[PDB]
Amino acid sequence: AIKRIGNHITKSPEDKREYRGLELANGIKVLLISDPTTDKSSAALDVHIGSLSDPPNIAGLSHFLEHMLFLGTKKYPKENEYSQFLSEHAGSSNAFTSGEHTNYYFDVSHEHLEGALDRFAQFFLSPLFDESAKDREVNAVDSEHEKNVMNDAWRLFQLEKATGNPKHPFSKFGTGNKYTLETRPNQEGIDVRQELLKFHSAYYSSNLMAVVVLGRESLDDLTNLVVKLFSEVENKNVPLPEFPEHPFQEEHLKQLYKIVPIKDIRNLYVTFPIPDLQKYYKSNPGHYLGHLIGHEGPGSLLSELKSKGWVNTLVGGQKEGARGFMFFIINVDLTEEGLLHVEDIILHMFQYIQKLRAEGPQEWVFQELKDLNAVAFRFKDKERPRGYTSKIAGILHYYPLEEVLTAEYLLEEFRPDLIEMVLDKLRPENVRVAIVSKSFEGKTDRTEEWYGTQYKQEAIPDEVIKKWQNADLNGKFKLPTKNEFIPTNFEILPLEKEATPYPALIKDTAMSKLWFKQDDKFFLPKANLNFEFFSPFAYVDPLHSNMAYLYLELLKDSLNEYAYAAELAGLSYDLQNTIYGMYLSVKGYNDKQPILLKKIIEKMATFEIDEKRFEIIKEAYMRSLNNFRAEQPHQHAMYYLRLLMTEVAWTKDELKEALDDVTLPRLKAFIPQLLSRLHIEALLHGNITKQAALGIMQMVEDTLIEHAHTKPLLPSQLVRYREVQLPDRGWFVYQQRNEVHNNSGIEIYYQTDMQSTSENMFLELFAQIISEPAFNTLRTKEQLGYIVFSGPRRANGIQGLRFIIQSEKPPHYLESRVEAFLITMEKSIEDMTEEAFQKHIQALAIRRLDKPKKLSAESAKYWGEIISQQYNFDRDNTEVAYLKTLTKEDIIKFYKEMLAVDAPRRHKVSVHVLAREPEVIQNMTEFKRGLPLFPLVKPH
Amino acid sequence: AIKRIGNHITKSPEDKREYRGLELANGIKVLLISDPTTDKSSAALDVHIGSLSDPPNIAGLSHFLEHMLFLGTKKYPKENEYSQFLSEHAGSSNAFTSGEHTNYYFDVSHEHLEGALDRFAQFFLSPLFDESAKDREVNAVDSEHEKNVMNDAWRLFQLEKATGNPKHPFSKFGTGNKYTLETRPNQEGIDVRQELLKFHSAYYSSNLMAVVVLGRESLDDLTNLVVKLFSEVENKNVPLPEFPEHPFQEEHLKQLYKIVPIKDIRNLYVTFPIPDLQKYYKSNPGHYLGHLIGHEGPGSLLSELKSKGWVNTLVGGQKEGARGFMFFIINVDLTEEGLLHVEDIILHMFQYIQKLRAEGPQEWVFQELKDLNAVAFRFKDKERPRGYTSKIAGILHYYPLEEVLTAEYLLEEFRPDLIEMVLDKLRPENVRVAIVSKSFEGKTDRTEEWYGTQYKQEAIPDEVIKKWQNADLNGKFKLPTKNEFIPTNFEILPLEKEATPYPALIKDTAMSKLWFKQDDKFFLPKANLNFEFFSPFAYVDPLHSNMAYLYLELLKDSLNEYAYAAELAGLSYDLQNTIYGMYLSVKGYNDKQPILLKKIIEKMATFEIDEKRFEIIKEAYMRSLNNFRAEQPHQHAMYYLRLLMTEVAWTKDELKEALDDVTLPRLKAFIPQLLSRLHIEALLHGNITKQAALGIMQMVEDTLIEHAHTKPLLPSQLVRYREVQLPDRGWFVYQQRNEVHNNSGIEIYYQTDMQSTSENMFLELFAQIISEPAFNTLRTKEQLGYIVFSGPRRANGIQGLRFIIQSEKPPHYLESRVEAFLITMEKSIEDMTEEAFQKHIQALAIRRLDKPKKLSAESAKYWGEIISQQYNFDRDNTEVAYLKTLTKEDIIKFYKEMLAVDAPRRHKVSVHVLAREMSQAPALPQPEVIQNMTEFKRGLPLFPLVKPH
């Protein structure tokens, strides 16, 4: 069925990838991506037969088929063979299934597309779905359900799927566990495999593909190479799975629901099933809804609710649904005092609806957000070869081949009818209410079938109905104003005399230190900024750390309602604290980061306090403190890891106790004492000059001395924390008991050495050569537990080696199998040939040598050196040049004194994180009391 | 001329030392001390021939003779044989010279009374005065005057000696330099030695001796031992040198002086030459005057002068002088407004004089302070066998044999006529004025002859004079009230079933820590108490550490006016800041330590700040911060020593700079935040029980939580500062230039080890064995300088070895000389016999083993364990048990790897202190200069701290 129809494609002229769409006569839509500049080529295939076309008795038949359609052909019937061919050419494929799609996508090393096409063609001629791949892949799907046990959003999602019409095919179960996929059909004698063959043969083989290939080959060779190759798909005219009715048919409308959550949250969830705008993608009022409903601005609803203290956060907007119907969701966070006023919150919601009803549609919002679509559509930076092709193949089904790239970022018409229409869909007739609160006890009986969440209707009384009906009024509400942060500075400045691949010290004082580099590679109008604010007062107490948290948090939170317009313009930022000081990040365009950032410095320099806001944030961090008894035991192990291996550390227990005495006058007194004398360090990167960067820095510290009279710090009180020396041979351990999880954790740590050129290679190559056999033996073969991790630990200028495994075991028993794996790797050193060595050092080589893809990525790497103050900018080529000087026999010399069991320089320490039910380590103070301390690193 | 007369002596009934006085017919006053339980016996001899009876041409002739009397006897014509015979058996003699006395004293190890005294008797028969002793001792006297150049109190002393009557023998020069000892006689052809023999023969043999022997034999055997041994002195009846005149004979009276000092001080010195009250020792009005003049009480003068902020400190009272005359001095500190209002200060002085004239004498004060000296004389602890005997032999000359122990601490009568009489003597007629300020520039022309300070007469105009006489009025002056800190608690508590030889941890909290022992040995109603207050916020920065200083300082000054009677009653204390926190000490009787200490805790818990008191203390310590550019280079070197050999250290520059921002609201806001949360560790020792100690401690910490809502500290914030590891083979050095001094300093340091039982005896034995050869060759023979010090360094639980030398040398040349001595000691390893091993470790052994001599003494040792948290109570016997286990080859192995130059364990570091403009050495390793001490220590490891015993 070799059919092709195409022409010139509107291709958003920043990309150079020339495009062409065509449709094959067996229901295969073909979009051609030609990138002769890509390192890795990619391809994607979306079948519009989704998981709504599954049989009602067997869950995840399309899910298990798109898992199983890879493995087993008449060419290659072996179990991992297709995947082993993707292990040859470095490609990491994945595929998925939705209600209206079942989608495939894959990449490849450089040009080996054909090889995967040869592995791919006999999927349509003869899919096999054999015994063993099936019986392990069902364990993979059951593990997928097992890891989605504790994700409550899928529980509530399925709760939306099941509390509609349970007869409607929307109400089916998407993934399917062990029990539904293979326990119930074969006890009913239904072969899952014959269903697979039926499903693929009738449904998949017929029609509804949407293929797209990111190839490097040409426009034409891959074209008449794959067009010709797909006539094995034969049209049978299977109809498109659509729904002519929504499952919400007034049984669950004008209804309340009360949900008991697994996580300690407070939420209210409102859903509106709404008619189709799939034909109305052109004007697309749902984008207008997402702009207007979730705006946080002058006279907005969230501004008043923060001013009323009822709402912490919200999200709302259009949720897509079936071909016929669509959804409209509202998901808000709840405070304490929202509980008596829940209905009043809903009243304010109807007030905002009436505010939109009062002023009707708006046109300058439509044209302005259209222009924002224009700007963001042009200034698309790059594209991932994975995921992008799966997305545009997702919309290749619904959109013409020239409209796939102008997907939603261009708007033709203005539809005040549709906007008023969905406002007519926002009425008390149309409301669904789902309340998320922990307090629901003994009262929510009706339990979910698959996962088990529990709810109750408690239909709305008439007082609230009539209050919903009559009260369509205005309160605070105003329409929001135009943003002011729109840039015009898009002009790339050519590189000057500062022609460096690494940021140079353009300014150093005793107050500041300023490193700078322009965008050599990426050539973007944006710029990224990193800031170190050093302070003595940071980790003096639990109290001061609490004051750092609360201060920075409520501080950033204050001008956040103003910041919504800043993030609305495309300018992101970060405020962070450290044990050493404060961290500031500024990312975005060149426009008003001086103006706005100066306004930020002036804001946090001279700042005021609300009384009850202070109490809520106080309680909130108190909540996070009480929360700290309940998290995942690997986080618990990393907490002890970074606890013991620093110089001083305040525990979360005494942090929890210390909030009994944190008063507002004490903080408010501390702040100018804090700000009186401190150090600032800054990294600047992007489309600017050096002298303008000097003027911005001069602005910033001028502002600082102007408001709070910042003085520099003494280079004897410019300190870092060291790391604990051990007596070179001991293996010490202790235990900690978990409360929540029945699994036990454990972590083993190695004091190797500073980051020298030798030790980086030693540790990286030894870790990577024990990385994949650990995956093969320990997790795959030994099946100890799902959370098994190994690897490095770079801290305080000292390398380290760490291992994270949680399971329910005796910990010394678990250590015994760890040591068994250590002996296995120990002999596997001696089992290394030259070839294993060479392929591994090539693996390490490509692991190390990889260009950045973002200014923030390389700024994060450089900043990661700056926080260690090392500046060894060409450690990459130095260490790689060193890497070729290593042998296998070298690492025995690394193994024997440092790593072996008889090793005299073995620096080994373990920590047990026991389930819910050497020498011991009783006192961490007495631990550090008679141990030496490491020296620090000479900075390059 | 052996004459003896004695009986029972009033012996202050706590002592058991049996006594006997007698006077020999050759003019020798004899006091017999019989203590058969004393470890060391001693003896002392004072001669009333002083340095005022010297010939007018040679200064310090009796001084040079009493240095030279030691060297040379007809039995032993060798130079040091007396002194070396006291170097054999641990007897440490010394002698001194005064205008009216020349005094000799020695001691002996146990039994050497006859030995040393037989070496001492020959001195009367045959002193030799040979060439070499003469020519080295004149350099010793001139170097003694040269090191006494810069002592400003002797400069002002000699300025008092010279600005009086220049005809009176008070105007002579007491010590005598090289110039007067051997430059003026030989250019006049006068033999110094024939003067010595003339002086010794004519003056000494006659009379005026006052001998005393602390012996351990009996009252009678030692008596007819020494009375047989001393008849060799034969009387010649030289009359008693007395002066019928005072030296201030209206030439320099009612006169001013403006003195330029060597140190940056501000002082005013007022002197009243007054007639003799030595005949009035029975009633002794002068002690009552010194009590009244310098009293700090309600309506007192000092209360107002502090209240005016003009006087930082003062001292006044009677100064003793010659036999004929005596002095009365007033020495006060000066502030900024004190500089303009000196005359008003004099007005305040005459106002207090008018208060004394207004109310006249007082009797209840006389009876009260007399009873205080009665009790204080009644209850005495113990004595040093050296120095005490020289003192009572000083007054054995002037008092009968039963009054030498009731010397001045018992008073018969009240003499208001004497009080009024000296009150008539204290008038503007009798005023001498000496102003000390270094701000006197271009105005003080008349330079001192010997020392070189410069002064000006600046005769007072008549307006101030007439203002001095007429203005004798009273303002807000009151007599001070009766004390309440007088104890009747004198009852020795019998020891209970809780019988410990070491203080036990009787109370432990996360708030407190309490150690306690009762007085086993001393049986005194007194008690001594030591306290550390640990705090995190003390050493965070220079700023708040300065604020802790100023706080504790102005705090202690506040309740000082109250504390004056307590310390006057016998209740002493200490407040002191540390890098960690505050240090508290409570010492005295058992009477009111809860009451007074409770009032102290309430005082420093709830304390307020005055603005101008703050300004004065702020400026004063501000002057102390740039004062540190001016001290001695060895002290400067020890500053760098404690700078570098701690974990963190703030320099004087950044400490000086940190007072630029100290406002009173920042300070007073910080202090209760500072004092919000802290820990206490405490040693209590003396006449008390355990439960009452628990109640006192409970009272204190309860009071603390009552005032400032104190909660205990976290055991993760119980920290110490560590000590820096070296790279185990390196030797680094750097230099610092002293601005003022032309001398160079140096200090060399060795990181040995922690205090293990082996290393203590290693370092003690090696330290003692290098003491005498370094003293023999480097300071004595090579004549490097006066600053030649060595010894241990126990810090941060780490032992250490240090050498402190400040001399005028190139520092690497001085290093070369040091290393030459190190090679000399290296050779002296193999030169040690077994006998020089055993006698030396026995010397160390008796050096180590000793009972304490004060309840405070052992408290300082125990507290020195407590600050190191060690508590190894029997570390001494443990170290002795190791001390018996050592060989010669042990110290070779200690030498080779740790001490030698070919050593893989070299922890050697030196520090140069340069001069103002700054015999065989091998190839030393290259050091590195230390530009940034933080970046120096950046690649240095750190020591562990000690697991506490």
Author numbering:
A (entry chain B): 46 to 962, 989 to 1011
B (entry chain A): 46 to 963, 981 to 1011
From the study:
IDE can effectively degrade insulin, amylin, and glucagon, pancreatic hormones that control blood glucose levels, as well as amyloid β (Aβ), a peptide implicated in Alzheimer’s disease. IDE is a 110 kDa zinc metalloprotease that readily dimerizes in solution (Kd =~ 10 nM). IDE has at least two major conformational states in its catalytic cycle; open-state IDE captures substrates and releases products while closed-state IDE performs catalysis. Within the IDE dimer, each IDE subunit consists of ~55 kDa N- and C-terminal domains, IDE-N and IDE-C.
Further 3D classification revealed three major conformations and structural models were built. We again applied IDE dimer-focused classification with signal subtraction of the IDE-FabH11-E dimer to refine each conformation separately, which improved the resolution significantly. The three conformers have resolution limits which correlated well with their relative populations: O/pO (4.2 Å, 73%), O/O (6.5 Å, 16%), and pO/pO (6.9 Å, 11%). Furthermore, two subunits within O/O or pO/pO states have noticeable differences in the distance and buried surface between IDE-N and IDE-C and the dihedral angle. The IDE pO and O states differs from the pC and C states by 5 Å to 24 Å increases in the distance between D1 and D4 and 7° to 17° increases in the dihedral angle, respectively. These changes result in decreased buried surface between IDE-N and IDE-C in pO and O states. Our cryoEM data reveal that two IDE-N domains within the IDE dimer undergoes rigid body motion, allowing IDE to undergo the transition between the open and ‘closed’ states without the assistance of substrate.
